[PDB]
């Protein structure tokens, strides 16, 4: 079989969208409050996550169709899914050799211990690292990686979504593209699409645990005052 | 004449309060988002001001009597006066030679141009620098400097204040201390108390101009997202 023209254009648009919103040089990281190694890494990681949310918003705005959704649906999707896209996109800096996220220099190498010093526990970081390891072992093509981020973003089964039918149809098209790409372009990937859909399930679980632990942070003003306005807004509970 | 015992204790408490909340080493400044020289200094100066608000809160909590005010009055006073205390306390880093605020190293030397790159204009920065120059020329004793900050903080004529009588009585006591200190301990200071009360008037005017320009910043989300939660809360308009 073969990929169609419109499927090809979708892949091209998503790859360009990711390249425009993920900077492999990580040179912007020097702008964040510096890392410190009670919650000494919270200022730096709050800034990193806030920066990453802006990038996910930029990526979302270039997913075909997402822009044509209502403003409310665009927000509903980003508020539920941003944390999952950040976990997905961070796989690009994750290193199997170091078991850490390496962002171009030792100051911006984050191990599990660094994240505990931002207020998180092993209840989140143990499944998150196992998630990153298994995702990294899938050896995803860049095409597959950006499709999976877009499919995750365009899930209609999230709280607050109104136009369920329209969003599901968009996600259905991307899933069709991903299945066809794997079948035609990924040698020996007969089990790959299923493994990727499992990763989407894993992300729901990581989402819930992160939300639990973020709630605890956001309820202590001495910690929440270290967050950014954008993090407060996107990870907050307003409707 | 002579200062009384209770006047002496007030001066001692205010000096100790200032020493505990103003760190002449400025070593905490490396924790801020770094300075960059559209509004390239806004992240760094937002962090500096947010840090300074915490210090003013710490100073306020050690003013005799301020703690025994209601929580609402404590907040009303800090929300109206914090910007003025920051302008007063910054005189300690202001340099007549450089016309700038020099905070222990060239990275943390702020000239007028640096502050314009945080969203402010000469309508604020011209009177502010003239204010700093004239205040610096008063050659205030440390005792006089901390009394003036406490008197500014304990002004009952600010919006939101409820127990007007109680706060005015506290401010009256501090004014009495300051007049007696100048008369007894400041040689040739016969015009000093009057010049200091004029500076309090100047600060009302600097307050209004800063509030004008801060409102403009806080109404543009691409700028307000660079502020801190504490700055948003203290300089915000909620009651």
């Amino acid at each position: 079989h073969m990929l169609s023209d419109e499927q090809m254009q979708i892949i091209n648009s998503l790859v360009e969208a990711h390249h425009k919103t993920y900077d492999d040089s990580y040179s912007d990281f020097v702008r964040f409050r510096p890392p410190v190694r009670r919650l000494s890494m919270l200022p730096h990681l709050a800034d990193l996550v806030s920066y990453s949310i802006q990038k996910v918003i930029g990526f979302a705005k270039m997913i075909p169709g997402f822009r044509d959704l209502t403003a409310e649906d665009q927000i509903a999707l980003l508020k539920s899914s941003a944390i999952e896209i950040i976990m997905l996109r961070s796989n690009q800096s994750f290193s199997l050799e170091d078991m850490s996220w390496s962002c171009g220099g030792p100051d911006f190498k984050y191990c599990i211990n660094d994240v505990t010093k931002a207020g998180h526990t092993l209840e989140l970081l143990e499944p998150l690292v196992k998630f990153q390891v298994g995702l990294k072992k899938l050896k995803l093509h860049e095409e597959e990686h950006v499709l999976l981020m877009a499919i995750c973003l365009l899930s209609p089964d999230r709280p607050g979504v109104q136009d369920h039918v329209r969003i599901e149809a968009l996600q259905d098209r991307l899933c069709d593209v991903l299945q066809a790409y794997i079948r035609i372009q990924h040698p020996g990937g007969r089990l790959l699409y299923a493994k990727m859909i499992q990763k989407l399930a894993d992300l729901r679980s990581l989402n819930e645990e992160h939300s639990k632990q973020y709630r605890s942070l956001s309820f202590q003003p001495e910690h929440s005052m270290q967050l950014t306005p954008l993090v407060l807004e996107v990870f907050g509970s307003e409707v | 004449h002579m200062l009384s015992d209770e006047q002496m204790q007030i001066i001692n408490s205010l000096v100790e309060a200032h020493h505990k909340t103003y760190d002449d080493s400025y070593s905490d400044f490396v924790r801020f988002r770094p300075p960059v020289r559209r509004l390239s200094m806004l992240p760094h100066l937002a962090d500096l001001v947010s840090y300074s608000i915490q210090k003013v809160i710490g100073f306020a909590k050690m003013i005799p009597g301020f703690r025994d005010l209601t929580a609402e009055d404590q907040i009303a006073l800090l929300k109206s006066s914090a910007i003025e205390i920051i302008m007063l306390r910054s005189n300690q880093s202001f340099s007549l030679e450089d016309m700038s605020w020099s905070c222990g190293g060239p990275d943390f030397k702020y000239c007028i141009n640096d502050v314009t790159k945080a969203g402010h204009t000469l309508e604020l920065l011209e009177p502010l620098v003239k204010f700093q120059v004239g205040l610096k020329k008063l050659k205030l004793h440390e005792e006089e400097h901390v009394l003036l900050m406490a008197i500014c903080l304990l002004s009952p004529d600010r919006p939101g204040v409820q127990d007007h009588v109680r706060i005015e009585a506290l401010q009256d006591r501090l004014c009495d201390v300051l007049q007696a200190y100048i008369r007894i301990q400041h040689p040739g200071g016969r015009l000093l108390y009057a010049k200091m009360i004029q500076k309090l008037a100047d600060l009302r005017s600097l307050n209004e101009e800063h509030s004008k320009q801060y409102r403009s910043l806080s109404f543009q989300p691409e700028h307000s997202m660079q502020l801190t939660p504490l700055v948003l809360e203290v300089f915000g308009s909620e009651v």
Partner: peptide, 10 residues
């Protein structure tokens, strides 16, 4: 609400 999100979503 969502002042910053609306702005970023253009």
């Amino acid at each position: 609400k969502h002042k910053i999100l609306h702005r970023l979503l253009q």
